[PDB]
Amino acid sequence: MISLADLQRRIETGELSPNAAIAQSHAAIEAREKEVHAFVRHDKSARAQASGPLRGIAVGIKDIIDTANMPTEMGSEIYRGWQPRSDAPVVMMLKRAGATIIGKTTTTAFASRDPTATLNPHNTGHSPGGSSSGSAAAVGAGMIPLALGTQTGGCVIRPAAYCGTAAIKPSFRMLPTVGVKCYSWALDTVGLFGARAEDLARGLLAMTGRSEFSGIVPAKAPRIGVVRQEFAGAVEPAAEQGLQAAIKAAERAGASVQAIDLPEAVHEAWRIHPIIQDFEAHRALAWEFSEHHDEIAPMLRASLDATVGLTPKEYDEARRIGRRGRRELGEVFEGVDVLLTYSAPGTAPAKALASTGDPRYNRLWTLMGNPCVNVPVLKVGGLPIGVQVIARFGNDAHALATAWFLEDALAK
Amino acid sequence: MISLADLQRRIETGELSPNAAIAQSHAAIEAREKEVHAFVRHDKSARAQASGPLRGIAVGIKDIIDTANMPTEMGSEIYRGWQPRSDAPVVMMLKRAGATIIGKTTTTAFASRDPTATLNPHNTGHSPGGSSSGSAAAVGAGMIPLALGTQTGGCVIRPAAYCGTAAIKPSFRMLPTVGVKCYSWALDTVGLFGARAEDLARGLLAMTGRSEFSGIVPAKAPRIGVVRQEFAGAVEPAAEQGLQAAIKAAERAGASVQAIDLPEAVHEAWRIHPIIQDFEAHRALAWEFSEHHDEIAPMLRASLDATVGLTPKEYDEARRIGRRGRRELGEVFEGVDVLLTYSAPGTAPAKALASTGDPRYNRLWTLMGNPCVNVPVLKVGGLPIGVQVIARFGNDAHALATAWFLEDALAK
Numbered sequence: 001m002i003s004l005a006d007l008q009r010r011i012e013t014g015e016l017s018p019n020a021a022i023a024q025s026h027a028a029i030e031a032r033e034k035e036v037h038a039f040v041r042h043d044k045s046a047r048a049q050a051s052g053p054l055r056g057i058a059v060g061i062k063d064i065i066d067t068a069n070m071p072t073e074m075g076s077e078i079y080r081g082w083q084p085r086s087d088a089p090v091v092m093m094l095k096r097a098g099a100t101i102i103g104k105t106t107t108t109a110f111a112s113r114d115p116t117a118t119l120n121p122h123n124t125g126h127s128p129g130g131s132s133s134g135s136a137a138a139v140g141a142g143m144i145p146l147a148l149g150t151q152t153g154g155c156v157i158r159p160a161a162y163c164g165t166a167a168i169k170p171s172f173r174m175l176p177t178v179g180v181k182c183y184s185w186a187l188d189t190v191g192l193f194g195a196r197a198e199d200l201a202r203g204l205l206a207m208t209g210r211s212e213f214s215g216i217v218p219a220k221a222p223r224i225g226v227v228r229q230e231f232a233g234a235v236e237p238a239a240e241q242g243l244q245a246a247i248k249a250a251e252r253a254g255a256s257v258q259a260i261d262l263p264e265a266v267h268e269a270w271r272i273h274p275i276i277q278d279f280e281a282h283r284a285l286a287w288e289f290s291e292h293h294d295e296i297a298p299m300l301r302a303s304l305d306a307t308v309g310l311t312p313k314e315y316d317e318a319r320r321i322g323r324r325g326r327r328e329l330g331e332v333f334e335g336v337d338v339l340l341t342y343s344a345p346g347t348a349p350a351k352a353l354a355s356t357g358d359p360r361y362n363r364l365w366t367l368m369g370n371p372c373v374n375v376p377v378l379k380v381g382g383l384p385i386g387v388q389v390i391a392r393f394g395n396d397a398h399a400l401a402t403a404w405f406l407e408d409a410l411a412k
Numbered sequence: 413m414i415s416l417a418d419l420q421r422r423i424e425t426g427e428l429s430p431n432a433a434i435a436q437s438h439a440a441i442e443a444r445e446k447e448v449h450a451f452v453r454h455d456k457s458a459r460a461q462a463s464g465p466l467r468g469i470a471v472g473i474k475d476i477i478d479t480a481n482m483p484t485e486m487g488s489e490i491y492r493g494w495q496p497r498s499d500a501p502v503v504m505m506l507k508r509a510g511a512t513i514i515g516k517t518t519t520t521a522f523a524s525r526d527p528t529a530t531l532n533p534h535n536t537g538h539s540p541g542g543s544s545s546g547s548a549a550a551v552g553a554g555m556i557p558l559a560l561g562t563q564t565g566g567c568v569i570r571p572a573a574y575c576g577t578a579a580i581k582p583s584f585r586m587l588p589t590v591g592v593k594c595y596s597w598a599l600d601t602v603g604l605f606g607a608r609a610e611d612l613a614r615g616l617l618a619m620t621g622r623s624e625f626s627g628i629v630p631a632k633a634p635r636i637g638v639v640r641q642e643f644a645g646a647v648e649p650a651a652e653q654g655l656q657a658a659i660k661a662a663e664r665a666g667a668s669v670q671a672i673d674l675p676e677a678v679h680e681a682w683r684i685h686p687i688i689q690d691f692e693a694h695r696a697l698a699w700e701f702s703e704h705h706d707e708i709a710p711m712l713r714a715s716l717d718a719t720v721g722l723t724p725k726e727y728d729e730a731r732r733i734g735r736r737g738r739r740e741l742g743e744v745f746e747g748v749d750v751l752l753t754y755s756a757p758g759t760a761p762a763k764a765l766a767s768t769g770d771p772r773y774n775r776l777w778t779l780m781g782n783p784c785v786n787v788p789v790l791k792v793g794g795l796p797i798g799v800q801v802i803a804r805f806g807n808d809a810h811a812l813a814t815a816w817f818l819e820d821a822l823a824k
Contacts (some may be wrong), residue, residue, distance in 0.1 A: 068699060082497050092698030176597055178696050182590045210724045284590050286504030287480065312622045 001165060001195035002028065004057055004145035005202050011056045018048030018056030022100050025058035029102070029143040035124060037117050038137035041070050042103040052098020053206040059094050060105040060138045060147035062131075065190075066179035067091055067101060074181050075107040075116060075131075078292045088179025090148060090190050090207070097206035105134025105147055108356060110285060111155055111183050114297035115354055121163055123382050126348040129159030130356030132191070136163040139193040140384075146203050147193040152183045152277060154344070154362020156191030157388055160374040161343030162357065164384030166403065167193045168200045170396050172369030174208070184280040186319070187273075187366050197373060197403035204396070212397040218408055219401035224250060225260040225336035231267040232360040236346025242377040242385030243342060246406060249377075250340070253409035260336065262329070269325025270364035272318035277363075278307040279315040322367050326393070329368050333392040338402045340387055343374045347383035361388075371396035373403040377410060413577060413607035414440070414557040416469055417614045423468045430460035430468030434512055437470035440555045441514070447536060449529045450550035453482055454515040464510020465618045471506055472517040472550045472559035474543075476593035477602075479503055479513060486593050487519040487528060487543075490700060490707045500591025502560060502602050502619070509618035517546025517559055520768060521709035522697060523567055523595050527768055533575055535794055538760040541571030542768030544603070548575040551605040552796075558615055559605040564595045564689060566756070566774020568603035569800055572786040573755035574769065576796030578815070579605045580612045582808045584781030587619070596692040598731070599685075599778050609785060609815035616808070624809040630820050631813040636662060637672045637748030643679040644772040648758025651773075654789040654797035655754060658818060662752075665821035669752075674744065681737025682776040687730035689775075690719040734779050741780050742804065750814045751802040755786045759795035773800070783808035785815040789822060 002025070010016040029042055040063045048056045066072050066084035073079045091101060106116040111131035118133040120126040121141035128137040132149025139147050140163030149156050151169040160167030168191060175190040182188055194200045198216070205213035226247060228235070235243075247257050282289065282304065288296055289304055296304065332339070342361045349355045365372050365388075373389040389406060391399035414437070422428035441454055452475045460468045478484050478496035485491045503513060518528040523543035530545040532538040533553035540549040544561025551559045552575030561568050563581045572579030580603060587602040594600055606612045610628070617625035638659060640647065659669050694701065694716060700708055701716055708716065744751070754773045761767050777784050777800075785801045801818060803811035 068703075079497065085491060085494055086699035089695045089698050092702060093695070096698065096702065173597070176594075176692075176695055178594045178597060182588075185585070185588060185590060208724060280588075283501045283505070283588055286501050286508065287498040290504060290508065291480075312620060 002145040003195040004199040021056030022048040038134040049098040054097040054099035058102040062149040063104040064181035076109040093207040109297035112300040129162035131155040139165040153359030161386035162348035182284040184277040219405040221254040238380040239346040246387040249409040265328040275318035279310040339390040343386040343388040371399040416557040416611035433468035434460040450546040461510040467510035470514040475516040478591035488521040505619035524712035526709035541574035543567040565771035573798035574760035594696040596689040630817040650758040650792040658799040661821040675740040677740040684730035685775040691722040691727040745804040755798040755800040783811040
């Protein structure tokens with residue numbers, strides 16, 4: 001994979017010019033796009049900017065995120081050829097930093113369950129995960145140093161795990177969702193894909209200008225709390241193998257690791273995530289459901305058809321449950337710095353299964369809002385397995401520092 | 413003004429036909445548009461729908477809210493002729509209920525300070541307020557029974573007061589802002605304009621299906637806490653005249669009224685509203701400011717230019733203050749059911765002043781998020797003056813019930 005942090009340093013010293021860096025990316029996309037199919041649109045004329053911390057850094061943009069110079073089709077025929085008037089604020093954050101918007105990456109229809117045609121970079125016979133399919137696949141195939149995606153369930157962490165890339169779903173609302181096709185406004189969170197945790201840090205620093213992302217360095221002897229989310233059921237063997245391998249590497253690296261239980265309030269929050277998500281989806285996709293029902297991809301069409309009856313009452317009750325979960329979760333972080341858990345149920349499903357993977361081990365955290373980071377651990381049968389590093393809400397910097405620590409620990 | 417509830421009852425009994433009701437609005441619009449200029453565009457072909465509680469109900473939509481069959485120009489030349497692919501979720505809530513989208517009402521450029529051409533229905537030489545200028549004016553001129561607008565500072569309560577219409581800014585995030593041009597995602601809240609509190613209630617019931625808005629009746633012996641927002645500066649005589657009239661009427665009607673000073677934490681929240689609003693506006697309008705700077709209307713362009721230096725650090729601190737403010741405001745509602753205060757500084761400013769009015773008495777509540785309702789009280793020199801009823805967050809129903817009680821109290 002291409003490291004944004006590495007390119008930044010070489011461009012800064014003058015060893016690499018922004019133009020050359022961008023040509024590197026176009027060439028990398030050209031080299032594997034025909035086999036991975038990670039881009040809805042590759043702008044071959046995209047050029048490097050002359051200044052800014054991200055000059056020479058090519059970025060892929062999930063196609064539910066508005067761009068003014070390229071179409072934003074939401075991964076649906078309903079939006080075929082749709083051209084937004086403006087670039088989404090997060091896209092402008094990248095452009096203002098000197099970055100190059102090299103193309104739009106594939107997204108499942110309206111960021112839901114319907115598979116895209118994108119293939120896993122590690123084995124084209126498997127899913128790259130979803131819904132940020134293209135962003136994860138592009139970074140995983142070494143095409144680009146950075147890519148934006150979104151997460152409502154686990155659309156960021158899961159595909160990152162499946163494609164073996166580092167990724168972060170920042171604290172809820174740190175990054176604006178303006179210009180980001182909404183599925184659930186209570187959940188939707190913009191995320192980033194990169195080679196390693198340090199690349200994510202540099203990306204967030206340039207996009208936000210927040211000092212918390214400046215000077216980040218690997219954490220030391222972190223206090224890790226292991227949670228296996230039993231409420232979501234048992235994970236597949238490969239996922240547990242990756243977790244055990246991560247715990248051992250962390251310990252031998254000097255970290256204190258303890259298995260912790262999550263408050264009942266948190267278990268309940270995981271349970272009602274679907275209520276909040278699906279109820280809001282019906283309001284957020286009202287026009288599509290009412291005027292273009294049959295044109296909505298099959299799986300999403302079915303999920304919507306099966307949730308039309310959700311009431312404002314059970315919705316409010318679910319939101320109340322979610323708020324109680326957030327409160328008590330914070331308590332868990334009084335004795336531990338970060339939580340360590342699964343990033344996905346196991347290795348990426350075969351494409352033949354027509355599934356982007358079960359988001360059950362990701363959804364709770366999107367509702368709680370905590371910053372989550374995927375750390376590639378190993379591969380089973382050639383398929384990547386990762387672990388998810390979670391810090392307290394607003395502690396994104398620490399999540400990245402511990403992830404970096406974990407990466408070094410795994411490399412021994 | 414036209415009453416939504418009135419129309420509903422007459423249509424439900426068969427006493428009035430939906431087509432007749434719509435023909436009446438078309439007539440009312442044609443009768444005064446050359447005088448008021450409240451519509452960017454009027455769809456004369458708009459007809460009543462066959463079913464739903466809002467069939468026969470003509471609705472005006474502030475032009476920053478997306479419509480699929482009519483342009484959405486944001487009150488800016490930058491979006492001249494812009495045509496959204498879909499109807500915003502709040503527009504669908506109305507359409508699914510059987511309402512008729514009769515047209516797009518004028519909005520200041522990107523819902524900020526730059527005056528539109530719209531004039532006050534009560535006095536053509538005066539401003540109708542802003543930024544929901546057209547919705548307040550159209551409803552105030554008896555053109556339509558309902559209109560949607562938005563509030564970031566006091567873009568709903570203020571123009572409603574200036575134009576003498578009832579209006580409500582529901583609790584924050586109750587109505588989705590998907591498809592609503594963002595100014596500040598921490599503040600932007602959709603609102604409704606109608607003739608009376610009851611009209612607002614029936615409107616929210618149809619849009620949301622929330623039982624809380626069904627069967628609402630005037631409150632009995634409401635416990636009112638009066639706040640003059642000293643931290644907001646010196647109010648104009650007319651405004652105070654209106655508040656005292658409201659207090660006297662409520663007392664005679666059986667309400668218990670007591671004066672109360674808001675906590676320092678709340679005063680602080682009021683002070684930092686501009687920080688949150690303006691820092692976020694730079695992100696939300698990044699594309700416009702970076703690519704079409706000189707095309708941004710004068711006053712908004714000026715405010716953005718003066719605030720480019722706002723930092724993430726002071727923004728975070730402002731949000732901390734906001735949270736402290738919300739926490740301590742909640743305690744205030746332990747002894748009172750609602751708070752009563754000014755809806756604006758005084759009577760609507762003359763158009764010659766090139767000002768849609770100062771939102772200093774509105775902005776705090778938009779940040780706190782509580783439901784706010786404007787109650788027309790009296791007129792000084794022919795210009796309307798209203799008072800603002802505010803309830804605990806999530807208790808929009810009680811705010812409308814108390815507003816209703818207050819309307820009946822004033823009617824003696």
